[PDB]
């Protein structure tokens, strides 16, 4: 009522005074400081009149930057800080696959388009520059794949491996080292581990997307719930006759639990 | 010094003013200041070491330029780049490109020795995931993809370090030579066709950077803002 209106007016005056004091302090800084502004960073970017086409189930991190001709299929994941800008060419990422965080899937020329198949992992900080990776492959963390490289189905490039131009990684084979020597044969248990890793990371992507697609109200509500349910007392709960069950909001899905 | 004292006093005054603003917001019932927003700034400064970036030079919003970077005209810094020059300066010429997810940083502390400022010349590609650490690269050069360059590395004009090469401290890559391998070593001499390819790649990549900057300078989407705000 009138009390609320008066308190709102007082708060407005106090807010104006505080903003004036903040501006005075910023002026006294000497102009060196760079004021923090809005985000200005767009996750999905349309370039060359050519828009990204991502599925409704793909988890694309807000820190991830997809630009231009990236087309990502069902159940895929693009993690935090990964860059996929198909502007001079196209990038086609299949279904059930994951491109982990801080990685880069760039394409060149205008022709060596970047193709990544299904149920394939491209590990942390991995660099791709126009590769053709087939289904159910495995590129390790830090592996860099140059122009025209082709990796066959069920083939592994180990961590920190340079794979040069026009090199073909054959099926059921592991390639490791700076000039990417042949290493091993990637046995059946390893292939099963590859498939299980793809499925588990798809589930982890679903969990991450569910957590990351929350607005301010959901974030605040779950923060309050987490703070209140962080620690529990059983003596007083038993004395009162209460249980204090964990809410379903903080229950992590069993797909990502050991 | 007196400048740093005034900087600290300004910080105190700014903190007090922001506290007063938040008190007024709480009086109004506006709790949106509690909304945790990203505080990342594309250009971040130290006390008196604000980065310099010429106009008509592309800097991606995801790229972070910390400290004493000195970007020149018509050059590009792409998404995910980190350019740290707090301990010592970073000089970056005109027409060069710092491609995606790259890092150009100066050494922290003087434990190893004197801190060498980072120098990058004109019309030079500085790699696609390179990790340059206080080195000097001359004009019309091609630092390769995911390449490590340690302090003291001097890459000469029209010289190539291939992808994945790790050039160790106090190593010079001479004119018209390609160096690669984890213990970076010479592989094969360059050709005038490859040098022309380097220059043409630099030019067309600067053009692509201009296109990216033009596309990115568009106004923020009110539709997207409303979509995020409401549910």
């Amino acid at each position: 009522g009138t009390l609320g209106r008066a308190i709102y007016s007082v708060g407005f005056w106090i807010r104006e005074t505080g903003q004036a004091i903040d501006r005075l302090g910023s002026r006294l800084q000497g102009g060196y400081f760079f004021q923090e502004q809005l985000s200005r960073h767009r996750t999905l970017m349309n370039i060359f009149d050519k828009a990204p086409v991502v599925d409704k189930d793909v988890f694309v991190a807000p820190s991830a930057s997809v630009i231009g001709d990236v087309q990502v299929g069902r159940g895929s994941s693009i993690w935090y800080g990964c860059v996929l800008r198909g502007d001079v060419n196209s990038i086609r990422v299949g279904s059930g696959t994951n491109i982990q965080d801080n990685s880069l899937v760039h394409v060149a020329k205008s022709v060596l388009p970047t193709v990544i198949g299904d149920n394939v992992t491209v590990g942390h900080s991995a660099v791709l520059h126009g590769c053709t990776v087939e289904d159910e492959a495995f590129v390790g963390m830090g592996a860099v794949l140059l122009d025209g490289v082709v990796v066959e189905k069920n083939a592994m490039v180990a961590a920190g491996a340079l794979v040069r131009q026009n090199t073909r990684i054959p099926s059921g084979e592991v390639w490791a080292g700076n000039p990417a020597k042949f290493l091993r044969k990637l046995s059946n248990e390893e292939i099963t581990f590859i498939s299980q890793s793809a499925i588990n990371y798809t589930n982890l992507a679903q969990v991450h997307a569910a957590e990351n697609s929350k607005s301010y109200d959901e974030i605040e509500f779950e923060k309050v719930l987490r703070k209140k349910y962080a620690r529990k007392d059983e003596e007083y709960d038993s004395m009162l006759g209460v249980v204090r069950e964990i809410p379903p909001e903080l229950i992590l899905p069993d797909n990502v639990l050991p | 010094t007196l400048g740093r004292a005034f900087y600290a006093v300004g910080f105190w005054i700014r903190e007090t003013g922001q506290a007063i603003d938040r008190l007024g917001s709480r009086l109004q019932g506006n709790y949106l200041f509690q909304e945790q927003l990203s505080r990342h700034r594309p250009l971040m400064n130290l006390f008196d070491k604000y980065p310099s970036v010429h106009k008509d030079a592309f800097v991606a919003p995801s790229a972070s330029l910390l400290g004493d970077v000195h970007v020149g005209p018509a050059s590009s810094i792409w998404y995910g780049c980190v350019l740290r020059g707090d301990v010592n300066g970073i000089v970056i010429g005109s027409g060069t490109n710092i491609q995606d997810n790259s890092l150009v940083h100066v050494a922290k502390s003087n434990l190893t020795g004197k801190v060498l400022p980072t120098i990058i010349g004109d019309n030079v590609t500085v790699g696609h995931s390179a990790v340059l650490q206080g080195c000097t690269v001359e004009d019309e050069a091609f630092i390769g993809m995911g390449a490590t360059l340690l302090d003291g590395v001097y890459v000469e004009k029209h010289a190539m370090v291939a992808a994945g090469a790790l050039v160790r401290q106090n190593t010079r890559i001479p004119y018209g030579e390609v160096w690669g391998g984890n213990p970076a070593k010479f592989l094969r001499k360059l050709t005038e066709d490859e040098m022309a390819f380097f220059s043409q790649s630099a030019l067309n990549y600067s053009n692509l950077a201009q296109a990216h900057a033009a596309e990115n300078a568009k106004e923020l989407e009110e539709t997207e803002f409303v979509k995020v705000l409401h549910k």
Binding site: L3, G4, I7, Y8 | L27, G29
Partner: peptide
Amino acid sequence: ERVSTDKHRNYAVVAGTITILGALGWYLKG
């Protein structure tokens, strides 16, 4: 649209302003 809708917070603000005024009057009269 320009009113605080929390009755409890409004009463708390009124009590705080009353406290400040009372403390100031006590200091002045002491």
